[PDB]
Paper text:
Here, we present structural information for the human antibody PN-[name]’s heterosubtypic binding of hemagglutinin (HA) from circulating and emerging potential influenza A viruses (IAVs). The globular HA head domain recognizes host proteins bearing sialic acid on their surface, while the HA stem triggers the fusion of viral and host membranes following endocytosis, allowing release of viral contents into the cell. Anti-stem antibodies exhibit much broader cross-subtype neutralizing activity in vitro and in vivo by inhibiting the low pH-induced HA conformational rearrangement, hence blocking membrane fusion. In our structures, we found that each Fab variable fragment interacts with just one protomer of the HA trimer, and PN-[name] recognized conserved residues in the stem region of HA by binding in a very similar orientation to the HAs.
PN-[name] had a large number of somatic mutations in both VH3-30*01 and VK1-12*01 genes compared to the unmutated common ancestor, and has a long heavy chain complementarity determining region 3 (CDRH3) (16 amino acids). We determined the structures of the PN-[name] Fab fragment alone at 2.5 Å and of its Fab variable fragment complexes with H1, H14, or H18 HA at 3.2, 3.4, and 2.6 Å resolution, respectively. The high-resolution structures of the PN-[name] Fab alone and PN-[name] Fab variable fragment in complex with H18 HA allow us to analyze conformational changes of PN-[name] upon HA binding in detail. The structural alignment of PN-[name] and PN-[name]/H18 reveal that their CDR conformations are almost identical, except for CDRH3. The CDRH3 loop formed by residues 97-100 G undergoes a largely rigid-body rotation, pivoted around S96 (CDRH3) and L100H (CDRH3) to facilitate interactions with HA. Additionally, the side chain of F103 (CDRH3) moves by 4.5 Å to fit into the hydrophobic groove of the epitope. The structural characterization of PN-[name] bound and unbound structures highlights its long and flexible CDRH3, which can accommodate the differences in conformation and environment in the hydrophobic grove of the HA. Given that the CDRL conformations in PN-[name] bound and unbound structures are almost the same and CDRLs in PN-[name]/HA complexes only interact with Helix A of different HAs, the different Helix A orientations in different HAs cause them bind to different CDRLs.
Residue numbers in the entry:
A (entry chain A): 1 to 226
B (entry chain B): 1 to 214
The structure:
């Protein structure tokens, strides 16, 4: 009922601009102050900007002063965050948040009642690139055995994310798809692994399905022992 | 600028346990401290404001206390849906400030990792770069040390690590380590090894292959 809908995120090269939007519904919008909060991947929460209910007073973190501009539109019940001179340090998921009232009293400084779903901002000089997919072949140092491990190296793609399934979804037990790491080149790389019984090798085929929609890339890599 | 310091950074507990998280401020914030809950992929969720006032709908097992500089969040009996990250927030003054966060994890018995090493594929070798991957599978607790060695030479600055969350069925972790070399460097040496130090191991486990077909 009461919710904040966000939009405007995306991938942008360093030094460019972006404008975030937060549309409110279900509550009196222009009675509340409003805040923008961001959270870098793996990091914690950081407040970036706030504005009073009437738009007369605006507050900024030191990290964004002179660069970010907060504003609001009462007719549209919409909150804005104009972000200029973006740098990779600004890569995060951005939220709009509403300070909680205390028994009818609207205070801009309180715990944050309601949060938007978030919109992701990526600041990178990298260009869209499909992943290279390499097999992590299962091994042996005898002929028979117990449980074997095989996997899929999804390397050098941009931007996030890639989806990985095994045998078109028929293989889910023992699967670990690891979070991507950001390499020095600016491209991402992750690996998906699965543990199988050693009797399966040779009899059962293992196919790793990698989809990267930003580049319309779809790869089916069969992983067999060398 | 007021800075908040949460303690501890993480805690492992079982369902039914009593968990106590503290938040310390560099200045006095009277009673303008809020507590949040966050699960991966979702926005934060307010639990406490005014340092003791429960949000509407939040279970009564969540209690907040304290004033001035020292504060405390308490969960009187942990429930399965309470394993998440918890943040304190200061609302005494601008700028608004969050604590580093406290992650409450599922406690279980020690589990030693299964270690696997994977040589680079021949398809990648044609591109001019080689990636050796090492897998640590289903271990607990999370603390582990992976050291790469090539011809017994300890590597530095050419590897990256990635860890999953606790598995939904056995509460263990898994870890992937990727050593990245140039093909010329890779063909220049023979034995590639992955050394794993974990408290479930009496001695470090090393897995190794040697380049060729061995």
């Amino acid at each position: 009922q009461v919710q904040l809908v966000e939009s405007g995120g995306g991938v942008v090269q360093p030094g460019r601009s972006l404008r975030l939007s937060c549309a409110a519904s279900g509550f009196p919008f222009s009675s509340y102050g409003m805040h923008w909060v961001r959270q870098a991947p793996g990091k914690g929460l950081e407040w970036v900007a706030g504005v009073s209910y009437d738009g007369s007073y605006k507050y900024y973190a030191d990290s964004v002063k002179g660069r970010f501009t907060i504003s609001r539109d009462s007719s549209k019940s919409t909150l804005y965050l104009q972000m200029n001179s973006l740098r990779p340090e600004d890569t995060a998921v951005y939220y709009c948040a509403r300070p909680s009232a205390i028994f009818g009293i609207y205070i801009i400084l309180n715990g944050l009642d309601v949060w938007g779903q978030g919109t992701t901002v990526t600041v990178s000089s990298a260009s869209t690139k499909g992943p290279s997919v390499f097999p992590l072949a299962p091994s042996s140092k005898s002929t028979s055995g117990g449980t074997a491990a095989l996997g899929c190296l999804v390397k050098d793609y941009f931007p996030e994310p890639v989806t990985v399934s095994w045998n078109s979804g028929a293989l889910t037990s023992g699967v670990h798809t690891f979070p991507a790491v950001l390499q020095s080149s600016g491209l991402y790389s992750l690996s998906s692994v699965v543990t199988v019984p050693s009797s399966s090798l040779g009899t059962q085929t293992y196919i790793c399905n990698v989809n990267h929609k930003p580049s319309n890339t779809k790869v089916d890599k069969k992983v067999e022992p060398k | 600028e007021i800075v908040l310091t949460q303690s501890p950074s993480s805690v492992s507990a079982s369902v039914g346990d009593r968990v106590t998280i503290t938040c310390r401020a560099t200045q006095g914030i009277s009673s303008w401290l809020a507590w949040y809950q966050q699960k991966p992929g979702k926005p934060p969720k307010l639990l406490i404001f005014g340092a003791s006032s429960l949000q509407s709908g939040v279970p009564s097992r969540f209690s907040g206390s304290g004033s001035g500089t020292d504060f405390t969040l308490t969960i009187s009996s942990l429930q399965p849906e309470d394993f998440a990250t918890y943040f304190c927030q200061q609302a005494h003054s601008f700028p608004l400030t969050f604590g580093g966060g406290t992650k409450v994890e599922i406690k279980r018995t020690v589990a030693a990792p299964s270690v696997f090493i994977f040589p680079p594929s021949d398809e990648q070798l044609k591109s001019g770069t080689a990636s050796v991957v090492c897998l640590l599978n289903n271990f607990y607790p999370r603390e582990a040390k992976v050291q790469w060695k090539v011809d017994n030479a300890l590597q530095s600055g050419n590897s990256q690590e990635s860890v999953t969350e606790q598995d939904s069925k056995d509460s263990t972790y898994s870890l992937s380590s990727t050593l990245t070399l140039s093909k010329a460097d890779y063909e220049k040496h023979k034995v590639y090894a992955c050394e794993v130090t974990h408290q479930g191991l009496s001695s470090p486990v090393t897995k190794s292959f040697n380049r060729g077909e061995c």
